[PDB]
Amino acid sequence: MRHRKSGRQLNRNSSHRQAMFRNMAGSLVRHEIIKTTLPKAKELRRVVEPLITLAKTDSVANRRLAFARTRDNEIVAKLFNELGPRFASRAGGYTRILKCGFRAGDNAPMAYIELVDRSE
């Protein structure tokens, strides 16, 4: 009956979830801004931010894990080289959510999510 659990199911079998957040988080770290339905975003913080904290310090093993997940050389290279140092000292909170709200196609709630200081 659930009490004290933490883990959204999002109507997908566990493999599909893991693959989904994989491709999705890669899309996030790549585009910085991304638009997505709200529960996915809130469930996306938990996936993405730890990668950046993993990336806060270079080492061979850290690249081996950062590549071991996401499985994409361009983004793992993009961390450490770039998004690694760029978070020189933020405690966390790398991502913020911004609810644009309500996609018209099925009236699902929506929100952008982005790295804390895209700035431009």
Partner: peptide
């Protein structure tokens, strides 16, 4: 705008997110 939401311009609480 809806409260706790981006304005149609892309403004939210002054700052202009989404260029």
């Amino acid at each position: 705008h809806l409260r706790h939401h981006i304005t149609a311009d892309g403004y939210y609480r002054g700052r202009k997110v989404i260029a």
